């Protein structure tokens with residue numbers, strides 16, 4: 395069975411933080427992420443502190459030795475969990491690298507929006523434009539960013555209309 399233990403509404407907890415960018419950037423990257431998944435499907439969510447929610451989004455700094463410790467300039471950036479019991483929504487961002495919103499380094503909004511889908515139930519897809527595509531093509535033109543039909547196909551296989 396695909397959707398998150400069959401639930402159609404879940405709760406997200408920002409407890410990560412960039413120093414390089416203000417909280418307004420880390421907070422608005424998690425919000426912007428969430429609200430864009432709602433722009434393509436009727437699956438709902440909120441963003442709040444409660445005390446460990448359905449989805450936790452927390453900082454990782456040289457501690458991520460559960461799969462791979464501090465890499466810094468290195469392919470693996472941030473993770474999230476989905477077809478799990480307890481890891482049903484749990485995520486990590488690496489403060490070992492430079493998180494950016496203007497294509498210089500680690501694209502904050504894009505990487506955040508991927509962790510949201512990677513927690514809803516979505517694995518890696520195969521369109522270069524897809525938010526679930528596993529390679530950051532480093533495209534500087536943040537005006538052409540859009541969700542692809544293939545990542546849309548997979549979130550539709552979770553909930554749908």
Ligand SMILES: COc1ccc(S(=O)(=O)N(CC(=O)NO)CC(C)C)cc1
Pocket residue numbers: 469470471472473474504505508509512525526527528529530
């Ligand atoms: C489009 O947004 C992305 C977000 C995270 C990554 S990642 O490098 O952190 N990554 C791990 C992962 O699966 N995260 O959920 C894939 C990489 C190890 C191939 C890659 C792309």
Ligand SMILES: [Ca+2]
Pocket residue numbers: 465466467468469470471488490491
């Ligand atoms: Ca890294």
Ligand SMILES: [Ca+2]
Pocket residue numbers: 447448449450480481482483484
């Ligand atoms: Ca969880």
Ligand SMILES: [Zn+2]
Pocket residue numbers: 458460473486
């Ligand atoms: Zn982890």
Ligand SMILES: [Zn+2]
Pocket residue numbers: 473474512518
């Ligand atoms: Zn992923």
